[PDB]
Design a protein around this ligand. Sequence first.
Ligand code: NA
Ligand code: NA
Ligand code: NA
Ligand code: NA
Ligand code: NA
Ligand code: NA
Ligand code: NA
Ligand code: NA
Ligand code: NA
Lengths: 112, 112, 112, 112, 112, 112
Amino acid sequence: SDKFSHITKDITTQLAKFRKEMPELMTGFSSLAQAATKDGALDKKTKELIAMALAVAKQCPGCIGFHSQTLVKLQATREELLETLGMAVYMGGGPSLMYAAEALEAFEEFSK
Amino acid sequence: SDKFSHITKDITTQLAKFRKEMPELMTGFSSLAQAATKDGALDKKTKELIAMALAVAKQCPGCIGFHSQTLVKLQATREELLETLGMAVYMGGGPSLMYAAEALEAFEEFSK
Amino acid sequence: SDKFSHITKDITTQLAKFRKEMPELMTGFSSLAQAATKDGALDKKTKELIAMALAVAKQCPGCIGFHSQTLVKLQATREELLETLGMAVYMGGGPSLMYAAEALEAFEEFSK
Amino acid sequence: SDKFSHITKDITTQLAKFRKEMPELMTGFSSLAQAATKDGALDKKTKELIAMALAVAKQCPGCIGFHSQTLVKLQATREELLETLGMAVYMGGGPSLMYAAEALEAFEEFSK
Amino acid sequence: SDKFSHITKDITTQLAKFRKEMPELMTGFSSLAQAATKDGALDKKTKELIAMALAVAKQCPGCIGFHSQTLVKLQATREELLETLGMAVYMGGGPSLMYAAEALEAFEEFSK
Amino acid sequence: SDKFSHITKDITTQLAKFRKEMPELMTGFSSLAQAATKDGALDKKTKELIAMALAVAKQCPGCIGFHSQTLVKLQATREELLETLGMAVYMGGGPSLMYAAEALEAFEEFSK
Ligand code: NA
Ligand code: NA
Ligand code: NA
Ligand code: NA
Ligand code: NA
Ligand code: NA
Ligand code: NA
Ligand code: NA
Ligand code: NA
């Protein structure tokens, strides 16, 4: 019931080490991430929906964890999430359907 | 200068046979594709931006070709494309940058 | 000892939600899946062996779960499974060997 | 019309050097390949159909080229190929369809 | 606290079955692996750092497990590991950062 | 004989636009790339050998092109390249062999 909470927490504790021990690298990465996700022609929620689809296509539970968490914070609706997942399924078939299930689980977990 | 026109045309020629010879499979596929891309909580343009990011992440010149063509049809702006490519680069690093290049080329080609 | 039983059960509960909330999409997907796996020039067991190899190549525990379960139901032998896995290893190297191990574990789990 | 002939020939030219300069590696590889593809519980044609599905899932024109050539040698039927491509599409969605196109083209090319 | 110990142990028990039941295949694979990793122009530690980067790029917990274990045995430093991981992040973006976190966790686990 | 020269030049032409139109993103990216590839516990040549293995594993002709060019600049030996390709083949099987072919071709092209 706290599967993705644990995944994201555990990754975050390792990432704190990276930020201390590879500070130039992580500063560069942070700049990339912030530039990619900032408000622009596409708003932040829309970019995070794009991120969620990518997370599912890349079959990465950590990404699914963090971006579903962010989507809840950005107040994405369940319907907006499902429709993003549908795009991943169309462009990934069976395996993306499996990770779409995980993304729904993550989103529901972080939704309370 | 006709690079992605030729890529998409050549794929379409092969798929024309596949569609007729595997009609149950491909009516299944087309219905999945239509269901995924239809207007809903997300509009069609937004879903095609998601498709473009996925095409780049999948490193697939054919997908990039078809979805760039569709983005032009849906009148996505250059800036909307750029920002969705930005998300692919954040989630894919160096290799995604190589296919962001292809997406920009394809988009420009189909924009005339 | 019930690792893959739990994986598949958990995915199935999310998929029931998808079937209710994205019924056109899941109907389309179901049609695709049924057309792909139905008896033809290749029998159903052979297509599921193909699916198992793909599941291993795609490194997807959910797919490995469901298709190993189906292989047992279709009465695939252990030798037929291993030889399919061998093909994945030849075309995937080290990482596919890791997921081949998981596929054997799944198959043995569902075999009683 | 000689597309996959040239792709495979060009790869073979490069690999000819690699095989002589990394002979321990490549005798290791060839023995793995032979062991994987040998007749067993699954016959050779069936294993090459599995290889074709994997080649498509790996989105690799070179693999698609070589394995289509081998399928013709093993006298796989067009319908057997179509059904294995069907499985790749079910497990890969849109992007796999782009490489199913290439597999059909390659198979036709080597069929004369 | 013994996550990767369990992953590698469990894979190893299945691999013992493969070695008995597909002895030609596993002999071939073993030859490939030994030729790839043996001392040469690049020493063994350097090749294992290459393996670790590949394991992260391929998002394979099993590979991450075994190669981090080998790196400790080869007395790779923590700094050598982090810098390898940094290369994976540069060429993988967000998702490789997630698996880099897992690789650090694995390395620390096997380091005592 | 100018294959990878043209590939890299063509990508660079597209990216020249991308860099100016997404300057926050791409200054972020360049700083990440520089931070990742800088001399440290691993020297620059070693990191570029890691990058080459990753490029091959990602099956990306563009990456293979750019990183082969850089390897020549860093005066990597042919044998150092061969051994890093060996690692990619061990971790990728048949498909990686197809891109090892491309890496050898690119390296030879940029070596003159
Ligand atoms: Na640093
Ligand atoms: Na599936
Ligand atoms: Na790169
Ligand atoms: Na629907
Ligand atoms: Na491995
Ligand atoms: Na597509
Ligand atoms: Na054997
Ligand atoms: Na991410
Ligand atoms: Na192959």
